[PDB]
Amino acid sequence: ETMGNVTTVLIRRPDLRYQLGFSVQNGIICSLMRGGIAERGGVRVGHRIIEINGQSVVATPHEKIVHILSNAVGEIHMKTMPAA
């Protein structure tokens, strides 16, 4: 599993008030807040989140993907691809 163009991201989130800092739609990063944790994480726009903290969310719906990101803090391992 995890083949090809995968760019793992580590988000280190202090708590829930420190939101990701990137706008995602359906798992695809649409925008990134510069200076935010996501930038520090290595998140880039035009990337598709394929996994979050050990669960492949690439087949996970919008809500779920967002709900999961919204509640996860600490060292967060995501796997992103160039949305291809």
Short mmCIF file of C-alpha atoms in Angstrom, two decimals:
data_model
loop_
_atom_site.label_atom_id
_atom_site.label_comp_id
_atom_site.label_asym_id
_atom_site.label_seq_id
_atom_site.Cartn_x
_atom_site.Cartn_y
_atom_site.Cartn_z
CA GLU A 1 0.00 0.00 0.00
CA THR A 2 0.99 3.63 -0.39
CA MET A 3 2.56 3.52 -3.84
CA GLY A 4 3.85 6.17 -6.15
CA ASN A 5 3.59 9.81 -5.48
CA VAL A 6 2.90 10.10 -1.86
CA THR A 7 3.94 12.92 0.20
CA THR A 8 3.53 12.33 3.82
CA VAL A 9 2.63 15.26 5.97
CA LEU A 10 3.09 15.65 9.58
CA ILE A 11 0.88 18.07 11.25
CA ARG A 12 1.67 18.93 14.74
CA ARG A 13 -1.38 20.36 16.19
CA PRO A 14 -1.35 21.82 19.75
CA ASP A 15 -5.14 21.57 20.24
CA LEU A 16 -8.52 21.96 18.50
CA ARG A 17 -8.35 25.70 18.30
CA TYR A 18 -5.38 25.37 16.09
CA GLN A 19 -7.08 24.30 13.02
CA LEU A 20 -5.27 22.65 10.13
CA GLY A 21 -4.83 25.84 8.21
CA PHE A 22 -5.76 24.45 4.88
CA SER A 23 -9.00 24.31 3.06
CA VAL A 24 -9.86 20.87 1.87
CA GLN A 25 -12.72 19.74 -0.26
CA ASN A 26 -13.43 16.00 -0.50
CA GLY A 27 -9.87 15.33 0.47
CA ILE A 28 -8.29 17.74 -1.96
CA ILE A 29 -6.43 20.75 -0.65
CA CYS A 30 -7.82 23.88 -2.25
CA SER A 31 -6.02 26.54 -0.24
CA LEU A 32 -3.32 26.88 2.41
CA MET A 33 -2.93 29.51 5.09
CA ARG A 34 0.69 30.56 5.09
CA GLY A 35 2.09 30.62 8.59
CA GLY A 36 -0.34 27.95 9.63
CA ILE A 37 0.39 24.48 10.97
CA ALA A 38 -0.40 22.93 7.60
CA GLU A 39 2.36 24.92 5.95
CA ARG A 40 4.70 23.64 8.65
CA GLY A 41 3.32 20.19 8.04
CA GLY A 42 4.31 20.29 4.41
CA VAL A 43 0.84 20.61 3.07
CA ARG A 44 0.54 22.02 -0.43
CA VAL A 45 -2.39 22.95 -2.51
CA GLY A 46 -3.29 20.55 -5.23
CA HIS A 47 -2.77 17.60 -3.01
CA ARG A 48 -5.18 14.86 -2.18
CA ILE A 49 -5.24 13.56 1.35
CA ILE A 50 -5.08 9.82 1.01
CA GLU A 51 -4.53 8.86 4.65
CA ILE A 52 -4.95 10.42 8.08
CA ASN A 53 -3.43 8.97 11.31
CA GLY A 54 -3.45 5.45 10.00
CA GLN A 55 -6.72 5.40 8.12
CA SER A 56 -6.88 5.71 4.40
CA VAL A 57 -9.42 8.46 3.98
CA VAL A 58 -9.09 8.49 0.28
CA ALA A 59 -12.37 6.61 0.01
CA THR A 60 -13.81 8.46 2.92
CA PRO A 61 -16.57 11.10 2.32
CA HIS A 62 -16.12 14.92 2.71
CA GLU A 63 -17.74 15.12 6.10
CA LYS A 64 -15.79 12.28 7.55
CA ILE A 65 -12.48 13.52 6.21
CA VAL A 66 -13.20 16.96 7.68
CA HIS A 67 -14.59 15.59 10.97
CA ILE A 68 -11.53 13.45 11.45
CA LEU A 69 -9.14 16.34 10.70
CA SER A 70 -11.17 18.64 12.90
CA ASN A 71 -10.82 16.37 15.95
CA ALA A 72 -7.30 15.07 15.54
CA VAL A 73 -4.41 16.90 17.20
CA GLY A 74 -0.78 16.14 18.00
CA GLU A 75 1.48 14.42 15.58
CA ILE A 76 -0.82 13.79 12.66
CA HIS A 77 0.38 11.64 9.83
CA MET A 78 -1.28 12.26 6.57
CA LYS A 79 -0.38 11.03 3.18
CA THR A 80 -1.00 13.30 0.36
CA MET A 81 -0.65 12.77 -3.34
CA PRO A 82 -0.41 15.45 -6.14
CA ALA A 83 -4.22 14.90 -6.52
CA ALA A 84 -3.62 12.71 -9.53
#
